[PDB]
Design a protein around this ligand. Structure first.
Ligand code: POU
Ligand code: GTP
Ligand code: GTP
Ligand code: GDP
Ligand code: GDP
Ligand code: MG
Ligand code: MG
Lengths: 426, 424, 426, 424
């Protein structure tokens, strides 16, 4: 029961996915050759949530790896845990996507998507009771954004009563990584508003801030950033894979975190994150962890949470702890600072607890916030997009693939509507 | 897999190509006798053969290549020859002599394409101003467009300098090339010899240069551009991405190409050579590889290709700093004006060379309204020449017509107007 | 009881036959010198089905090897298992057949056929209870097609109450191997419609697809393709040679697979077929095997089975398995996708199971499908034939051997009737 | 076993035959002194003797053979001689001088047949245009037809080129041959010297050739044709199959013969030499071994004979690709227009030769309406000559009649009409 199918699309999506599979593997005591070397029966009890068993006690992640160019996936295969994946689950094209949503969604991606869908169907048929799908991609490129969105559309059409959740890497206000980012992001976001149940919004600038300000890390690698993201990802599904006092679930989280269907864009966080120098200096108390969790500096989106209000927040705690303490802390936060929580939803904080903590920690926590502050990201994207579109700058690359102006206007309209909705509850 | 085909046309282009191939060999450990797939097609004897087209109407440069060190490396066909050169005459390239050889070239290209399982497209090396590199190249490009359509056609072009030249029919030819590669080439990357000389004088502290050095420098840039296809790294850029990111409007597609750090052994030790510093150097007016001030122009779109040791955080910081500067002006309509590419593989040093080993190097490709000034200057030159109908009998005497020139001028004017509009 | 006599005719027929005899030999623990080196008594219990015993515990296949040219059979004799055959069972002529059905059926073949018949009679006289004959040939050439058909005619006339089954290699829609193929194939097929009880239709293009798409084999040899065919062949007769839970038989299969006498052209398949790279990645479950079996990509004919309906399918499973599971899987396929099974025959799938699995596998299966999609092959052949015949192209080679136009028209008529019949149930 | 008898007639034919025999010897390890059954009849002293008929009316070429390296190999009868050659005169071959020798030749052939236990038939080597090769060969063929009937009679023929020749009565002779081998020969394979020269110029990069090279090339083709009789392999083709597969109508039986890869040592290393590439080369207009464009004609039937390392899958793919091309036009009535033959034995290199060692080689035999043009040209030439009754006194003075020429012309016209019909 409760099988989850993973899809990783494009460069960033595949890279983050590799790290995620490493982390999950280590959590379950699975080595790169698919052999189990754990010490606890809890490690295998719910291994089926992420893994499929093969002859000779081999475990193979239910992961589908998708790209329009072979490089990234060749690197992944060459990598440490790369040999753990099913070879038949690498689905790739030959021509690149040129950071072009239209190529991912309408042309190059359209040619490949049926093949991906077939693999997806095959995997879903092996599920006793499939919970849903997890997707990893970027919003600013062509493959993860265009192809990824397309895949989501297809799967929701075919499996409309399953959970569809994405970890989506978004552009950052200071330092864009591509010139057409606003166009791609807007085109993706338009589709995600209507075709996903929840989306975790990750901002690389926030990750860098975490690495520098919090972790005191002089020289963060993308690998290190990926690790953090993977940790957050693992947190979300912990309650499917292990016992607890309050057993959470994806669906439960959705129920408690989405008060209106379109408002499903979350700011993720993780705790504790402490510098290697200052480890003995910190006392690892639930209160202190809570404080870390709620600190804007420990968020992974391009928002100031203090510039908005929390509609709902879900906290998932890992390790041994007093439920009394947890509840009291939650009460204290809300009573003290009631202005930062929407007044029309009493008890804005939901708590879940899983007994088994991650490696190397006695306690940890994962934070998921639905804040009206997220509107700032959307507003900024919209401004950027309009700045370009009003001059039809770069547009020939998209019209050449058959897109029309009207689609862009529709996207803009959707964006603005979303922003307006967010402003309502602000 | 990811595969691309090089085309080298003229004398200058061929020279550049030699350097490039040497660099490639140094990178991938291939010996001069052939003892990677992206550039080198592999055969059944542990032998690696370049995947290039080498074309010249004069059989001299090609002959040199055929006799020199890397003769066993190249195929006896890839190196193609003619009988007489165009002699700085677009008309003898595009109309008269080019239509004898072009078919063969096309066939070769087709063959090369057939040998690939995912052709990313083309890299072409020619020269605005030369007889072959102007007309013949244009002809080739048109044919390619007709054939393949949606295969990337990138160009590397030697732009004529303002205050210096080596041919007194160079305005005409260049103009003609511009006219007939405006509706074909997706990107035309630019290098200028005067600029390179200036760079040598300033940064390298060398004031006795030669063409070889220039070629090597160009090759470095080329390698940087193409490093993402042949090595691992965060942010692997593709040949198809450049078009998407550096071409806001289809006529506007000439971006400048600059490299940092271009520095000798003596002040490599003095300098820290951090990422931010390198980035700053990239945007400095004097360090640019053409004769234009980017203070007199707004940056539409820029692309940065970091190669070697680079913490992406540092790169981000550098970019932020650049953005902060008042400045370095960008256009109103392009806020996100940066593309970032990173490779773990560092730059490679060529024995008996100008440059020392570095930890990290950066190549910047920038599309800006600064080139408008250059275009205007060229137009003015053309006008000055064509008013008296100077040299026109040579061009008209091999195919061209009075009227074509006028059309070209009109096109140039239109381009200028477009640039002006973009500036607003 | 239940002796089977094998006839292999022409180049392809002899080549496939060699491989088949190798495979069967290894299954029965018989070495190339006819000595038994097995570990189980089950290996010898029913060895008489394919082999005849001689002095000194020598076993000699009941195989008759026929060709109009000596080359191929000389190669066979030179081959590994070539010395196992009875020298007197090589029957050959001197002049070739020139890819000419008329030469095989009416002229060159007519001169040799009596000699073959004598050998056949001799073999049948040594059978306590002869079940029937198995023939291997191509349809597109002269010897296997013309001579082979002729032999079939003769034997059916003499033994009309025995089973006559053929493994017939047919032309492929993309890449024909001879110019007169349509003529030869049509001439053969005409005779097979009326003189055989079942014909397994093998398409080399499908085999290549299997090798490249499924087995991931960069460089398949005809030997490798032959191996696959041999495996399928062995599957069919497994239940004569070994014990089981549901002991099948040739006749039983015919009874369940042929609802109308002329519709006896089957699409064969085999499972599992997995790449050497991705072996540990697959879990060898009966469900997964079933899925492989029913996958169009795992068929060996030039059909899209989804472009027609299954009249009946026979599945033969090899190894240890739960009958419960097997039955449930069969039910699931039919319930889920009832549109692909003719509605007038409830329970379109028949299952047989043999306890002893083939070498190197715990489980395997062989698939035999009577699908209305086969009409496409016939239609395409008919189109080709007519394209030539309407211009009397290449016809002088056949009229010169005494054939008349009327025969060709008759053949065409038969073909069209067959197609019409198939379309009825489509 | 499978056995065939070679017949070599003329000067040209004899030359070709020498080369062929050398090639055969190299293949099967037979020394020049005789120290396989398909071609070499074996005797009771560990000695292998060719199974051929060597005929010439002029005793010069034969004499050379008798004195040269392979004199001990051949029998003192197989090599037959006359006294005076026909001298480019069909009439002196077919009527006057041929009926002196023909009986002996027939006897020899009969003897050879008697020594075989399964004679597949005959391979004949002559020349359209030569005096002996035209008339004498025709006479021989007729006699063979009368005798054996249903034994394969394959011909290898040197077709006169359009823009070049070596005899100014060549149209007549060729026409006569065509007239009198239209109801006898089952296949007449074609090679043209001009085409071979062109091939040498282009692919081999050799522009100082001689007859020997041409002969060697022809011999390679012959070997490829006959390789299935003498070695193992998937798809073993027979001499009897060609007739079935390449002759849609009994008058239409002239297919062109081409070979790939014909390439020197230098660009053997540069090229991959894959199966598909070779197949493509086979269908290319310039690579064909006659002076005709197959773009101006529909392919009726083609036969491909792959020799060496070949995965049949690859071959199939290549064929599919070929079929796909618009594109290379086939006739409406022949959809299946391919026959495929494969051998494990690779090609064999002849010391002091033109060609290098290869992994895999292909020989293509194609029957097409492109030869119609050639036929028409020949007819036109004949008409131009015969209108003035030029040279006719030579032919009429030894047997022929005014009227025969007319009949021949009519026959040619009929053939042309048939070809036209086929084209529709
Ligand atoms: C029942 C008779 C039968 C008809 C159908 C449609 C059957 C049913 C199912 O198999 C039993 C399909 C199956 O459940 C899957 C979805 C897992 C899957 O195998 O489907 C194919 C495509 C499908 O046709 C669409 C297939 O070719 C096929 O034959 O499907 C792609 C494949 O990629 C891995 C995978 O996605 C014909 O004999
Ligand atoms: N950087 C560089 N520039 C070169 C080189 N060779 C020539 N040039 C420049 O190219 C221009 C001349 O064009 P060429 O390429 O020499 O001319 P071409 O293409 O051979 O044409 P024709 O000689 O006119 O047939 C001048 O601006 C030269 O400075 C070289 O090796 N390196
Ligand atoms: N390829 C090739 N062609 C040849 C050779 N010898 C002659 N030819 C060609 O054959 C034609 C001349 O016919 P020959 O065979 O020389 O004449 P012949 O058969 O001896 O007849 P007569 O000399 O007329 O009695 C010309 O087209 C020659 O180019 C040769 O060794 N190789
Ligand atoms: N966090 C993270 N971001 C990445 C990674 N790789 C690329 N990116 C980001 O993803 C965006 C570029 O999209 P990318 O996935 O490479 O393009 P695609 O292959 O077309 O989908 C940029 O915002 C990059 O900063 C990675 O490994 N980790
Ligand atoms: N699968 C397979 N097909 C073959 C083999 N040999 C020949 N063929 C095929 O058989 C057909 C040619 O007929 P063939 O048996 O060689 O002619 P025959 O000797 O006149 O019957 C073609 O479709 C070939 O592709 C083989 O060993 N295996
Ligand atoms: Mg030049
Ligand atoms: Mg002579």
């Amino acid at each position: 029961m409760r099988e989850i199918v993973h899809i990783q699309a494009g460069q960033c999506g595949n890279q983050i996915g590799a790290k995620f599979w490493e982390v999950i593997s280590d959590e379950h005591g699975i080595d790169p050759t698919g052999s189990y070397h754990g010490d606890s029966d809890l490690q295998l009890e719910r291994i089926n949530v992420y893994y499929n068993e093969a002859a000779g006690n081999k475990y193979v992640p239910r992961a589908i790896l998708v790209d329009l160019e072979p490089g990234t996936m060749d690197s992944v295969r060459s990598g440490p845990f790369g040999q753990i994946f099913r070879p038949d689950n690498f689905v790739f094209g030959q021509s690149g996507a040129g950071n072009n949503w239209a190529k991912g969604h309408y042309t190059e991606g359209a040619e490949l998507v049926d093949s991906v869908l077939d693999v997806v169907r095959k995997e879903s048929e092996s599920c006793d009771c499939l919970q849903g799908f997890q997707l990893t991609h970027s919003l600013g490129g062509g493959t993860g954004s265009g192809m990824g969105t397309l895949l989501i559309s297809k799967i929701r059409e075919e499996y409309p009563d399953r959970i569809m959740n994405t970890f989506s890497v978004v552009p950052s206000p200071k330092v864009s990584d591509t010139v057409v980012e606003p166009y791609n992001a807007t085109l993706s976001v338009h589709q995600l508003v209507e075709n996903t149940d929840e989306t975790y919004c990750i901002d690389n600038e926030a990750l860098y801030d975490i690495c520098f300000r919090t972790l005191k890390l002089t020289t963060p690698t993308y690998g290190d950033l990926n690790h953090l993201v993977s940790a957050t990802m693992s947190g979300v599904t912990t309650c499917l894979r292990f016992p607890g006092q309050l057993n959470a679930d994806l669906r439960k989280l959705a129920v408690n975190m989405v008060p209106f269907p379109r408002l499903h864009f979350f700011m993720p966080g993780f705790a504790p994150l402490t510098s290697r120098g200052s480890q003995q200096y910190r006392a690892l108390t639930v209160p202190e962890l809570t404080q870390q969790m709620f600190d804007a500096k420990n968020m992974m989106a391009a928002c100031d949470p203090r510039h908005g209000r929390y509609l709902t927040v879900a906290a998932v705690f890992r390790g041994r702890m007093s439920m009394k303490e947890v509840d009291e802390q939650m009460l204290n936060v809300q009573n003290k600072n009631s202005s930062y929580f929407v007044e029309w939803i009493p008890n804005n904080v939901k708590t879940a607890v899983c007994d088994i903590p991650p490696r190397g920690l006695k306690m940890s926590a994962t934070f998921i916030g639905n804040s009206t502050a997220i509107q700032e990201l959307f507003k900024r994207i919209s401004e950027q997009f309009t700045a370009m579109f009003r001059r039809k700058a770069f547009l020939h690359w998209y019209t050449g693939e058959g897109m029309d102006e009207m689609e862009f206007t529709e996207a803009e309209s959707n964006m603005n509507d979303l922003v307006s909705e967010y402003q309502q509850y602000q | 897999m990811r595969e691309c085909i090089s085309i080298h046309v003229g004398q200058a282009g061929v020279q550049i190509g030699n350097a490039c191939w040497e660099l490639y060999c140094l990178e991938h450990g291939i010996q001069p006798d052939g003892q990677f797939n992206t550039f080198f097609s592999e055969t059944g004897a542990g032998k690696h053969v370049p995947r290039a087209v080498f074309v010249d109407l004069e059989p001299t440069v090609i002959d040199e290549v055929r006799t020199g060190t890397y003769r066993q490396l190249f195929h006896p066909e890839q190196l193609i020859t003619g009988k007489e050169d165009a002699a700085n005459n677009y008309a003898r390239g595009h109309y008269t002599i080019g239509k004898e050889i072009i078919d063969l070239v096309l066939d070769r290209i087709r063959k090369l394409a057939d040998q690939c399982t995912g052709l990313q497209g083309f890299l072409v090396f020619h020269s605005f101003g030369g007889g072959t590199g102007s007309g013949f190249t244009s002809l080739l490009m048109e044919r390619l467009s007709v054939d393949y359509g949606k295969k990337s056609k990138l160009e590397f072009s030697i732009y004529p300098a303002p205050q210096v030249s080596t041919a007194v029919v160079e305005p005409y030819n260049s103009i003609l090339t511009t006219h007939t590669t405006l509706e074909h080439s997706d990107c035309a990357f630019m290098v200028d010899n005067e600029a390179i000389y200036d760079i040598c004088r300033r940064n390298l502290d060398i004031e006795r240069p030669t063409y070889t050095n220039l070629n090597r420098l160009i090759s470095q840039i080329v390698s940087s551009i193409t490093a993402s296809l042949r090595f691992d790294g965060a942010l692997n850029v593709d040949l198809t991405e450049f078009q998407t990111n550096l071409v806001p409007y289809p006529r506007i597609h000439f971006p400048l190409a600059t490299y940092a750090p271009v520095i000798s052994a003596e002040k490599a030790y003095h300098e820290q050579l951090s990422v931010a510093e390198i980035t700053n150097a990239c945007f400095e007016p004097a360090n640019q590889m053409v004769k234009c001030d980017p203070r007199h122009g707004k940056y539409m779109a820029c692309c940065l290709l970091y190669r070697g040791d680079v913490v992406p955080k540092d790169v981000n910081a550098a970019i932020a700093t650049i953005k902060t500067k008042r400045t370095i002006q960008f256009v109103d309509w392009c806020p996100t004006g940066f593309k970032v590419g990173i490779n773990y593989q560092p730059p490679t040093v060529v024995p008996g060379g100008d440059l020392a080993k570095v930890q990290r190097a950066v190549c910047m490709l920038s599309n800006t309204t600064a080139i408008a000034e250059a275009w205007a200057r060229l137009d003015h030159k053309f006008d000055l020449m064509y008013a008296k109908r100077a040299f026109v009998h040579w061009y008209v005497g091999e195919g061209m017509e009075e009227g074509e020139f006028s059309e070209a001028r009109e096109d140039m004017a239109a381009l200028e107007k477009d640039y002006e509009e973009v500036g607003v």
